[PDB]
Short mmCIF file of C-alpha atoms and ligand atoms in Angstrom, two decimals:
data_model
loop_
_atom_site.label_atom_id
_atom_site.label_comp_id
_atom_site.label_asym_id
_atom_site.label_seq_id
_atom_site.Cartn_x
_atom_site.Cartn_y
_atom_site.Cartn_z
CA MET A 1 0.00 0.00 0.00
CA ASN A 2 1.10 3.57 -0.58
CA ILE A 3 -0.21 7.20 -0.58
CA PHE A 4 -1.49 6.89 -4.14
CA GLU A 5 -3.39 3.63 -3.63
CA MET A 6 -4.66 4.96 -0.34
CA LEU A 7 -6.18 8.16 -1.71
CA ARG A 8 -7.42 6.36 -4.78
CA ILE A 9 -9.46 4.14 -2.52
CA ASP A 10 -10.75 7.10 -0.50
CA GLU A 11 -11.59 9.41 -3.37
CA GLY A 12 -12.51 7.01 -6.14
CA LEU A 13 -12.01 7.89 -9.86
CA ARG A 14 -14.56 9.85 -11.97
CA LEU A 15 -13.98 11.08 -15.46
CA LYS A 16 -16.86 13.48 -15.70
CA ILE A 17 -17.44 16.57 -13.57
CA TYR A 18 -19.19 15.63 -10.33
CA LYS A 19 -20.13 17.04 -6.93
CA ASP A 20 -18.16 15.98 -3.93
CA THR A 21 -19.57 15.27 -0.42
CA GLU A 22 -19.80 19.04 0.23
CA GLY A 23 -21.54 19.66 -3.10
CA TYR A 24 -18.45 21.15 -4.87
CA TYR A 25 -17.52 20.50 -8.50
CA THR A 26 -14.76 17.96 -8.68
CA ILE A 27 -13.25 15.59 -11.14
CA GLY A 28 -10.84 12.70 -11.43
CA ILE A 29 -9.34 11.51 -8.16
CA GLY A 30 -10.71 14.07 -5.75
CA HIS A 31 -9.44 17.11 -7.68
CA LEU A 32 -11.54 20.14 -6.49
CA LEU A 33 -12.38 22.35 -9.41
CA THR A 34 -14.09 25.21 -7.64
CA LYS A 35 -16.37 26.09 -4.74
CA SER A 36 -18.55 28.13 -7.01
CA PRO A 37 -22.10 26.98 -7.66
CA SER A 38 -21.57 27.52 -11.41
CA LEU A 39 -21.05 24.55 -13.79
CA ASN A 40 -19.57 26.80 -16.38
CA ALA A 41 -17.15 28.14 -13.87
CA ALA A 42 -16.15 24.50 -13.20
CA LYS A 43 -15.77 23.66 -16.87
CA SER A 44 -13.59 26.73 -17.36
CA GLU A 45 -11.35 25.70 -14.45
CA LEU A 46 -11.15 22.17 -15.84
CA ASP A 47 -10.04 23.29 -19.30
CA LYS A 48 -7.49 25.59 -17.72
CA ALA A 49 -6.12 22.68 -15.61
CA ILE A 50 -5.97 20.19 -18.50
CA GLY A 51 -4.98 22.53 -21.26
CA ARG A 52 -7.69 21.84 -23.80
CA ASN A 53 -11.38 22.20 -24.34
CA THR A 54 -12.57 19.21 -22.41
CA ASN A 55 -16.26 19.59 -22.52
CA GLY A 56 -16.42 18.42 -18.81
CA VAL A 57 -14.83 15.09 -19.49
CA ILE A 58 -11.28 13.80 -19.20
CA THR A 59 -9.39 10.65 -19.84
CA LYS A 60 -7.82 8.36 -17.29
CA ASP A 61 -4.34 9.51 -18.12
CA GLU A 62 -5.45 13.14 -17.54
CA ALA A 63 -7.05 12.24 -14.15
CA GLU A 64 -3.86 10.55 -13.13
CA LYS A 65 -1.75 13.50 -14.13
CA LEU A 66 -3.89 15.78 -11.97
CA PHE A 67 -3.52 13.24 -9.21
CA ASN A 68 0.28 13.29 -9.41
CA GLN A 69 0.31 17.02 -9.25
CA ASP A 70 -2.03 17.06 -6.28
CA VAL A 71 -0.03 14.60 -4.16
CA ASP A 72 3.20 16.40 -4.84
CA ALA A 73 1.66 19.74 -3.97
CA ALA A 74 0.09 18.39 -0.78
CA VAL A 75 3.44 17.04 0.36
CA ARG A 76 5.18 20.26 -0.55
CA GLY A 77 2.59 22.34 1.25
CA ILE A 78 3.04 20.27 4.36
CA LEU A 79 6.80 20.82 4.32
CA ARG A 80 6.40 24.54 3.90
CA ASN A 81 3.88 24.66 6.75
CA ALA A 82 5.35 25.65 10.13
CA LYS A 83 2.67 23.86 11.99
CA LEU A 84 2.63 20.75 9.92
CA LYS A 85 6.25 20.14 9.10
CA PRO A 86 7.33 19.22 12.57
CA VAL A 87 4.56 16.74 12.94
CA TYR A 88 5.23 15.25 9.59
CA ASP A 89 8.95 14.95 10.34
CA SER A 90 8.24 13.17 13.62
CA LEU A 91 6.10 10.50 12.08
CA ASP A 92 6.84 7.04 10.60
CA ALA A 93 6.14 6.41 6.89
CA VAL A 94 2.65 4.96 7.28
CA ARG A 95 1.45 7.63 9.57
CA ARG A 96 2.88 10.31 7.26
CA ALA A 97 0.56 9.04 4.58
CA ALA A 98 -2.37 9.51 6.97
CA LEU A 99 -1.39 13.14 7.34
CA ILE A 100 -1.18 13.63 3.56
CA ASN A 101 -4.68 12.07 3.25
CA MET A 102 -6.13 14.59 5.69
CA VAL A 103 -4.38 17.47 3.81
CA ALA A 104 -5.60 16.26 0.46
CA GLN A 105 -9.13 16.21 1.81
CA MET A 106 -9.36 19.36 3.85
CA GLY A 107 -6.39 21.48 2.84
CA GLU A 108 -3.44 22.68 4.88
CA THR A 109 -5.38 25.29 6.69
CA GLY A 110 -8.03 22.83 7.76
CA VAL A 111 -5.52 20.25 9.12
CA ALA A 112 -3.35 22.89 10.69
CA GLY A 113 -6.47 23.68 12.82
CA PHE A 114 -6.39 20.31 14.64
CA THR A 115 -3.83 21.81 17.06
CA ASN A 116 -4.51 19.57 19.94
CA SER A 117 -4.47 16.34 17.87
CA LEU A 118 -1.31 17.48 16.16
CA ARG A 119 0.40 17.80 19.48
CA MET A 120 -0.76 14.38 20.53
CA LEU A 121 0.50 12.88 17.33
CA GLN A 122 3.80 14.50 17.76
CA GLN A 123 3.97 13.09 21.27
CA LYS A 124 3.18 9.59 19.97
CA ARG A 125 0.06 9.37 22.17
CA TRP A 126 -1.75 7.20 19.63
CA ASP A 127 -4.92 6.37 21.45
CA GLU A 128 -5.45 9.79 22.81
CA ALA A 129 -4.98 11.42 19.46
CA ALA A 130 -7.51 9.07 17.78
CA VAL A 131 -10.02 9.99 20.37
CA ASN A 132 -9.38 13.73 19.86
CA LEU A 133 -9.35 13.40 16.10
CA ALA A 134 -12.83 11.92 16.30
CA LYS A 135 -14.32 15.00 17.95
CA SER A 136 -14.65 16.96 14.79
CA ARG A 137 -16.92 18.01 11.98
CA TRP A 138 -14.64 15.98 9.70
CA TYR A 139 -15.46 12.78 11.55
CA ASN A 140 -19.18 13.58 11.76
CA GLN A 141 -19.47 14.35 8.01
CA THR A 142 -17.33 11.55 6.58
CA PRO A 143 -17.15 8.95 9.31
CA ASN A 144 -16.11 6.02 7.18
CA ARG A 145 -13.16 7.72 5.67
CA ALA A 146 -12.32 9.47 8.93
CA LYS A 147 -12.23 6.04 10.72
CA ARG A 148 -9.85 4.61 8.15
CA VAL A 149 -7.45 7.54 8.58
CA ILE A 150 -7.77 7.50 12.39
CA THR A 151 -7.07 3.79 12.52
CA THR A 152 -3.97 4.40 10.43
CA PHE A 153 -2.73 7.03 12.97
CA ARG A 154 -3.55 4.71 15.89
CA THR A 155 -1.92 1.55 14.69
CA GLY A 156 0.63 2.75 12.23
CA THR A 157 -0.41 -0.09 9.82
CA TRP A 158 -2.57 -0.24 6.62
CA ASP A 159 -5.04 -2.62 8.14
CA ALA A 160 -8.00 -0.31 7.57
CA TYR A 161 -7.29 -0.32 3.92
CA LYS A 162 -7.05 -4.04 3.57
CL1 LIG B 201 -4.51 22.45 -11.60
CL1 LIG B 202 -17.14 8.57 4.70
#
């Protein structure tokens, strides 16, 4: 298992514009197009991202390319983030992937707001952090995915994904 297979399982793959769990226009492997309520606005963003007049549809290879860019950016954002870097650096490889998953889903700002959990993770207080992570909108809105990530932080294994 790895970061790519992990997020691919969590986000799925869709080749036509669609609305995510929050109702925002997305495409491919969880790639947010825009928060605007406008389909045209979404199609314009898509074409700009892909580099061609897509007509709201992309191929597999194009989804995957967006996906590569998104993982790379997420990792890079983490490393440039004063609040996240230290946590990231303190973690083992499996748990690092759990952190990337949260960032890919809610952005840097969003994750960086779980101050208390972040400190517990850094301290290697696994059980306590999983309990704190669970007290959140994130867990209440997407419980299945949140449980998989939380289990990953708790055990440091990919069991939840198998
Ligand atoms: Cl883009
Ligand atoms: Cl879910």
